[PDB]
Subunit: 98 residues, 5 copies
């Protein structure tokens, strides 16, 4: 379950906490209409990972993509802070667990 | 099989949906006229990975390369949206599946 | 147990040595005020990974992220030299132990 | 067995095909006059991995280094298109086999 | 044991060959005056990994970090060509062994 720290930081925002998601697909598409990379859960939910060219968000967004690939490869769960103002909902923070 | 999201995205393009491919070889080639990154399926189908010079597309092509190499290492399947305009067909989108 | 080298180096500083920590969650956040990379231990303790825009510190901070991810994926323990000046405490050095 | 695609491509070149190589060592060296990245096979043969500073070859040579490492860590075989011009022979294409 | 090629190259330098080293710790430090990347062996021996900003040594030194980290995670041995002129001794070449 989400760390107290992660839930606290989500509840400072207007986003929604989604806990224990099992990501089973990870998508890279070159279409110019994308807003980043996408992950799909075992129940068919889709979320987007944002992109940023410069420091510092170029670090966090890369580590979001590393978390997604490690969660899909190993069957690890994640918790998400996801904003419903975009569709697919955009990930503002992600926690990989165990 | 392809998420609905990935299927819908491929249908907005001229490229073809190829589902459930088992990639078994990953090629890097710097020779004249054949330079590129390619993947080979267990039955001998060949595709070229997209390439891109600049941000944002070079983030997307880096993640395709990571997806294709992870699929080959782990024996995981991928779904592809691949363009028939050249041969080998060029992967415009890829979905790693667990 | 922390190498004597790592302990000697942390003894030069105002930070504190934390030994044998089991990291169980890895967080990337781009929210507006809590952005950063963090790790959470099995007891719920939280640390922020150092960030640096330029060479050479951006080499070491990238390896701190790689160490934190590998520790969470593998259940490998780490030793930290962590500054109590902020909450979460900032990791200024980390040792991955096999 | 190398894919026919990889054999056909190598056969366009002045390089030679080496199939089914088991790489057991991976070397990085920054000493004068020996600097480079190299691989050594189970029988003791040595190859240099190509290098390139610029796009697009900087992509393919980085993938060559990822393939080499993965082959050595997992005991996977590779097929190589290697130029006999210099010693060690330089890898111009490589195919990782699962 | 070290390849003949690795040994021949190290014998050309002022550095020492160290064979069969079992690395068990990997350190990243950004503290003043002790900053750097380091590895520690099962005996307590400590080495500094070379670093470089510019091409081409930025490639080799990144691969040295990847070799160190892989050796620690998987308990693989390395061979090193390490200079005694500094403490910790600096790694000028490294060979990962399967």
């Amino acid at each position: 379950g989400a760390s107290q720290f992660f839930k606290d930081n989500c509840n400072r925002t207007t986003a929604s906490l989604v806990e224990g998601v099992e990501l089973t697909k990870y998508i890279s598409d070159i279409n110019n209409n994308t807003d980043g990379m996408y992950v799909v859960s075992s129940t068919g939910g889709v979320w987007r990972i944002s992109r940023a060219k410069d420091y510092p968000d170029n670090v966090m967004t890369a580590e979001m993509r590393k978390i997604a690939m490690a969660a899909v490869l190993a069957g690890m769960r994640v918790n998400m802070c996801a904003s419903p103002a975009s569709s697919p909902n955009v990930i503002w923070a992600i926690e990989l667990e165990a």
